[PDB]
Design an enzyme around this catalytic site. Structure first.
Site, PDB file in Angstrom:
ATOM      1  N   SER A  26      89.043  63.254  53.837  1.00  0.00           N
ATOM      2  CA  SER A  26      90.129  63.134  52.849  1.00  0.00           C
ATOM      3  C   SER A  26      89.482  62.934  51.547  1.00  0.00           C
ATOM      4  O   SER A  26      88.447  62.651  51.312  1.00  0.00           O
ATOM      5  CB  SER A  26      90.871  61.920  53.011  1.00  0.00           C
ATOM      6  N   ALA A  30      90.969  63.255  47.074  1.00  0.00           N
ATOM      7  CA  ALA A  30      92.035  63.339  45.942  1.00  0.00           C
ATOM      8  C   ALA A  30      92.653  64.838  45.907  1.00  0.00           C
ATOM      9  O   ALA A  30      93.850  65.146  45.857  1.00  0.00           O
ATOM     10  CB  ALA A  30      91.661  62.895  44.568  1.00  0.00           C
ATOM     11  N   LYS A  69      92.990  72.922  55.639  1.00  0.00           N
ATOM     12  CA  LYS A  69      92.693  72.196  54.572  1.00  0.00           C
ATOM     13  C   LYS A  69      94.018  71.957  53.948  1.00  0.00           C
ATOM     14  O   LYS A  69      94.278  72.686  52.867  1.00  0.00           O
ATOM     15  CB  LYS A  69      91.593  72.649  53.663  1.00  0.00           C
ATOM     16  N   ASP A 102      75.898  78.802  46.058  1.00  0.00           N
ATOM     17  CA  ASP A 102      75.736  77.265  46.603  1.00  0.00           C
ATOM     18  C   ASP A 102      75.394  77.177  47.902  1.00  0.00           C
ATOM     19  O   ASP A 102      76.147  76.696  48.829  1.00  0.00           O
ATOM     20  CB  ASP A 102      77.205  76.487  46.294  1.00  0.00           C
ATOM     21  N   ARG A 132      74.422  71.658  53.721  1.00  0.00           N
ATOM     22  CA  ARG A 132      75.859  70.759  53.876  1.00  0.00           C
ATOM     23  C   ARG A 132      76.706  71.953  53.761  1.00  0.00           C
ATOM     24  O   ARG A 132      78.082  71.656  54.005  1.00  0.00           O
ATOM     25  CB  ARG A 132      75.874  69.946  52.561  1.00  0.00           C
ATOM     26  N   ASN A 133      76.438  73.133  53.330  1.00  0.00           N
ATOM     27  CA  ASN A 133      77.624  74.293  53.579  1.00  0.00           C
ATOM     28  C   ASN A 133      77.396  75.210  54.720  1.00  0.00           C
ATOM     29  O   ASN A 133      77.547  76.384  54.436  1.00  0.00           O
ATOM     30  CB  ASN A 133      77.548  74.826  52.278  1.00  0.00           C
ATOM     31  N   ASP A 183      81.724  77.477  52.404  1.00  0.00           N
ATOM     32  CA  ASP A 183      81.977  76.896  50.841  1.00  0.00           C
ATOM     33  C   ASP A 183      81.984  77.885  49.832  1.00  0.00           C
ATOM     34  O   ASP A 183      81.082  77.893  48.938  1.00  0.00           O
ATOM     35  CB  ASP A 183      80.986  75.819  50.614  1.00  0.00           C
TER      36      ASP A 183
END
Lengths: 7, 310
Positions: free
Chosen positions: B25, B27, B50, B142, B146-147, B160
């Site tokens: 989750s 913002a 998403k 990028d 993590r991607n 990503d």
């Protein structure tokens, strides 16, 4: 916390 | 002097998929796990949805759409695919579900049970995925551990594309202005002059490989991001991870040369790591390597997105 704005 | 992008962007109805869980989750919005049922087809497809948080600027909706633009125009076994988008009062992106999630998270929770065969195989697959991106003249901008997502432990995909920008036929390099950036993964070219090329992506490959080899350690940990440019200019690089033979570490160092031309190509990276993937123990020394091994909801009409074509 791995993404920054440098000059 | 480039070819028409005839990729199909698919618009999916709200009624056509079932949200079943929450993964992450924010913002900006939250990520759902669910099943994608294009009815009339009698198939259920596990997807990652998403869903936007309706509290959004027009500007926010766009950034996702451009990633959606990028994801829809790629077709590689090692690049994450976009299934479609839903224009609800909030634009949500529907992509293939990667059950094991983040590769960076994966190596850290399975440090105990990851063998050289897996580590080297991933390096090949990422190089394969990145090479496709070069063939389609695209720059990820990028590339990080993590991607990279895990579909199965033996199969990983690149993702990503928020910062992934494409170059026309007569371009080699192009500048950006600002925004928050991953300093620790970036080439020196990019930090100093905001120059991103395919060879700048080669740098991030070496850092990504270093992440895997250290089983999820943080590059330049403790060191502030401000000093990175200066340090790299001094000629310092990431230390050689313990499990790494000099052959493997040699390749990482090549990804970090000041001269981008001197850096390896992704097509070259596939070849070298494939050579090493045939004899994994010779190139990675891990304790208990000999004995390592790695691995739901109604799942009768379930197909995975890769087997679903249009």
């Amino acid at each position: 916390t791995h993404y920054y704005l440098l000059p | 002097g480039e070819a028409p992008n005839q990729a199909l962007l698919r618009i999916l109805k709200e009624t056509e998929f079932k949200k079943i869980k929450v993964l992450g989750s924010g913002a900006f919005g939250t990520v759902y796990k669910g099943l994608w049922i294009p009815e009339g087809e009698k198939v259920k497809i596990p997807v990652a949805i998403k869903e936007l948080r309706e509290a959004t600027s027009p500007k926010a909706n766009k950034e996702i759409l451009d990633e959606a633009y990028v994801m829809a125009s790629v077709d590689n076994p090692h690049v994450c695919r976009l299934l479609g988008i839903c224009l609800t009062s909030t634009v949500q992106l529907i992509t293939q579900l990667m059950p094991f999630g983040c590769l960076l998270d994966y190596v850290r929770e399975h440090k105990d049970n990851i063998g050289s065969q897996y580590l080297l195989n991933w390096c090949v697959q990422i190089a394969k995925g990145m090479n496709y991106l070069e063939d389609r003249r695209l720059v990820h901008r990028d590339l990080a551990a993590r991607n990279v997502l895990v579909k199965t432990p033996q199969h990983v995909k690149i993702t990503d594309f928020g910062r992934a920008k494409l170059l026309g036929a007569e371009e080699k390099e192009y500048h950006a202005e600002g925004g928050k950036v991953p300093i620790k993964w970036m080439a020196l070219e990019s930090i100093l002059h905001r120059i991103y090329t395919h060879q700048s992506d080669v740098w991030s490959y070496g850092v990504t490989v270093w992440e895997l080899m250290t089983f999820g350690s943080k590059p330049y940990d403790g060191i502030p991001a401000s000093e990175i440019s200066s340090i790299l200019e001094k000629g310092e690089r990431l230390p050689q991870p313990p499990i790494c033979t000099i052959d493997v570490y040699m390749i990482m160092v090549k990804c970090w040369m000041i001269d981008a031309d001197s850096r390896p190509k992704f097509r070259e990276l596939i070849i070298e790591f494939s050579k090493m993937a045939r004899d994994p123990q010779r190139y990675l020394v891990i304790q208990g390597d000999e004995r390592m091994h790695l691995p739901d909801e109604d799942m009768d009409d379930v197909v995975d997105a890769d087997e679903y074509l249009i």
